[PDB]
């Protein structure tokens, strides 16, 4: 009954950021030390919460959200940020309590000639609300003429591939990101630290 953090952090394939994965962690012992004692992460930022104090607390659910972005977008996975990722792909709330964890995945997610399998949303009629997930492929109406699902002048496909080549500069290399969210409901608290 160890919490299955391995299934998120060590997944062979990650989600595109527009279609970010969420894992519900429940009814298990959360060994947070496996994460905070690791040398495997370059980003490990916890807002209004300490992963060492999490060991002493119980939650109804913990959520692990995971996806790939490029290195210079990791800064957008934070409260109060703007840019294509925070605006159109994955939005944290201003009052976020939880952890943002990231690591360079150039060895897994780049290939010679380009890995194009990871996409981002480039166009949207409004910014995402916090933890909103938009997987629509509706043609984006950039002007006054309705598209009727046909691409052309002012009528664009709303997604685009990252081009991940192993020789990309570090700012253009793929990073795997996991966001931990903590939830208390009117229900049993089933996710507890080892204490």
């Amino acid at each position, epitope marked *: 009954n160890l919490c299955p953090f391995g299934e998120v952090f060590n997944a062979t394939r990650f989600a595109s950021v527009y279609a970010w994965n969420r894992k519900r962690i429940s009814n298990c012992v959360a060994d947070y030390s496996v994460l905070y004692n690791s040398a495997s992460f370059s980003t490990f930022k916890c807002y209004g919460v300490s992963p060492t104090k999490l060991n002493d607390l119980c939650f109804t659910n913990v959520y692990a959200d995971s996806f790939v972005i490029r290195g210079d977008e990791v800064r957008q996975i934070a409260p109060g940020q703007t840019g294509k990722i925070a605006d159109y792909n994955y939005k944290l709330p201003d009052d976020f309590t939880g952890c943002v964890i990231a690591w360079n995945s150039n060895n897994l997610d780049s290939k010679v*000639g*380009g890995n*194009y*399998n990871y*996409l981002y949303r*480039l*166009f949207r009629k409004s910014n995402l609300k916090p933890f909103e997930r938009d997987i629509s*492929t509706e*043609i984006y109406q950039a002007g006054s003429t309705p598209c009727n*699902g*046909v*691409e*052309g002048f002012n009528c*664009y*496909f*709303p*997604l*685009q*591939s990252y*081009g991940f080549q192993p020789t990309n500069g570090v700012g253009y290399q793929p990073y795997r990101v996991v966001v931990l969210s903590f939830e208390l409901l009117h229900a049993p608290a089933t996710v507890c630290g080892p204490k």
Partner: nanobody
Amino acid sequence: QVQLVESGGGLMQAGGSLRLSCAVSGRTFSTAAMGWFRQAPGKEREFVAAIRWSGGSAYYADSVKGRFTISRDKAKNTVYLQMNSLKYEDTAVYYCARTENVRSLLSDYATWPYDYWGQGTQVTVSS
């Protein structure tokens, strides 16, 4: 390995219509677009048409607009080129091409590189 296999080429009288097929096997999920190109002997290969795999919007070279139609059957992993009103000038080897690069602007598929290519099928338009 991803394989592209064209079929349907042959001898046609001018003014007739012919459908080419290109069947794709191996990886499926990753396909962004499929294109048709053609090359006459001693001439440079040229873009004919592209189709976005999701959604199915098509982009055409000016020299085949109103005449050729590109279409695809996702379930059969196959792209088609319906070549109406055949001209002597359409005589060439027709090549299908596949890209996994999702581009927001459909017109990118007229000039961006394709990483997978078929062996080509010969179309000859007589009289």
